[PDB]
Amino acid sequence: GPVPSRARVYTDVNTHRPREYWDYESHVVEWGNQDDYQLVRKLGRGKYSEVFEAINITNNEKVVVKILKPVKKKKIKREIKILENLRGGPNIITLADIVKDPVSRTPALVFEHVNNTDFKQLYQTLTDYDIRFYMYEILKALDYCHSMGIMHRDVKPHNVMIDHEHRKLRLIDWGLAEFYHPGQEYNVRVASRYFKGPELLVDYQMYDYSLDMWSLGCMLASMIFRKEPFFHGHDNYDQLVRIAKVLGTEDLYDYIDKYNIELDPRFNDILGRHSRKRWERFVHSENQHLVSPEALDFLDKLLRYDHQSRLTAREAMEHPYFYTVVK
Numbered sequence: 251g252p253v254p255s256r257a258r259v260y261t262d263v264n265t266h267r268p269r270e271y272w273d274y275e276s277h278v279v280e281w282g283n284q285d286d287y288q289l290v291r292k293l294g295r296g297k298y299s300e301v302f303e304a305i306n307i308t309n310n311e312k313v314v315v316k317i318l319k320p321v322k323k324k325k326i327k328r329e330i331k332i333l334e335n336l337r338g339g340p341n342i343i344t345l346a347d348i349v350k351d352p353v354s355r356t357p358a359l360v361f362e363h364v365n366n367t368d369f370k371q372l373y374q375t376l377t378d379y380d381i382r383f384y385m386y387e388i389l390k391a392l393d394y395c396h397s398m399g400i401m402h403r404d405v406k407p408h409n410v411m412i413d414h415e416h417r418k419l420r421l422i423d424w425g426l427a428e429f430y431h432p433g434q435e436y437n438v439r440v441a442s443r444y445f446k447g448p449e450l451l452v453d454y455q456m457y458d459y460s461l462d463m464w465s466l467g468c469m470l471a472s473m474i475f476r477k478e479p480f481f482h483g484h485d486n487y488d489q490l491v492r493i494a495k496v497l498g499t500e501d502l503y504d505y506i507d508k509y510n511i512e513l514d515p516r517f518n519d520i521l522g523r524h525s526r527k528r529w530e531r532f533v534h535s536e537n538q539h540l541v542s543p544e545a546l547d548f549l550d551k552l553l554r555y556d557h558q559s560r561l562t563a564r565e566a567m568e569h570p571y572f573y574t575v576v577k
């Protein structure tokens with residue numbers, strides 16, 4: 251069958267942690283006082299939850315409350331344990347409390363509030379320096395969670411909350427995050443379409459932290475080229491075709507051949523043959539001020555078919571692209 255794969259870094263972080271650390275199913279939730287929190291306004295909802303702005307009446311501080319929909323019980327403790335494991339880490343959203351909602355009869359997670367600017371509006375205004383600055387901040391969060399044996403699996407602009415006033419960033423929504431264990435096969439139905447790594451799109455289950463680095467590359471491409479999203483597929487199959495029109499089909503076949511993976515035969519009549527493109531193809535007068543040789547090389551090293559070939563978060567932070575960012 252498929253050739254096995256291992257993360258090239260933080261491979262055995264969880265094997266050497268106490269079982270309590272990664273065995274989220276055995277986690278016992280510590281419950282706070284639901285009366286401490288008053289809901290103020292609904293912010294939105296996902297397939298799995300509804301999110302509200304709220305107020306902590308013990309300190310009159312703004313917080314966010316995420317009421318988990320009664321769906322997929324298993325996922326509850328997983329998200330909670332991951333949040334508790336990562337609490338205090340650089341640019342990780344802080345879980346402030348966990349309470350039982352009396353209406354939904356499900357857990358409600360209480361998070362720190364970030365005074366963010368919607369990415370749709372924000373990406374339009376980011377300068378070159380801003381993109382480098384915020385990329386570096388995202389990498390701090392990703393190197394941290396990876397070093398702690400966790401992959402996020404849903405890196406995308408919505409989940410990177412940025413307070414542009416105080417230049418503060420938080421990686422949110424760890425609802426899809428998982429513990430990395432060498433040799434483990436994972437669900438490929440993770441991440442948002444435009445940010446799904448080639449591993450997911452070719453149904454390769456033995457993936458790792460490097461999935462997040464593909465997603466980061468997709469964000470970077472959208473920012474420096476001012477095209478959001480960058481790979482704009484109409485479904486999961488067209489998504490891979492869009493990628494192959496840029497990275498080329500020969501390197502896609504090299505990738506699947508390396509892992510002895512077969513494409514879904516439905517690609518037979520949609521994939522075609524495509525050359526690899528040079529990144530300069532995507533530069534034009536309206537985005538050129540965001541582009542530099544350093545940006546393109548960094549991007550090039552994130553967006554590899556082979557998850558094993560991508561920059562790690564730590565390697566990424568060493569890139570010349572970040573030399574100009576004040577440390």
Ligand SMILES: O=C(O)c1ccc2c(c1)nc(Nc1cccc(Cl)c1)c1ccncc12
Binds near residue numbers: 316361
């Ligand atoms: O899920 C979490 O970890 C999570 C954690 C924190 C926030 C969040 C989701 N969603 C927010 N806003 C938001 C905006 C639009 C739609 C939805 Cl559903 C949510 C938000 C805003 C300000 N500060 C923290 C958060």
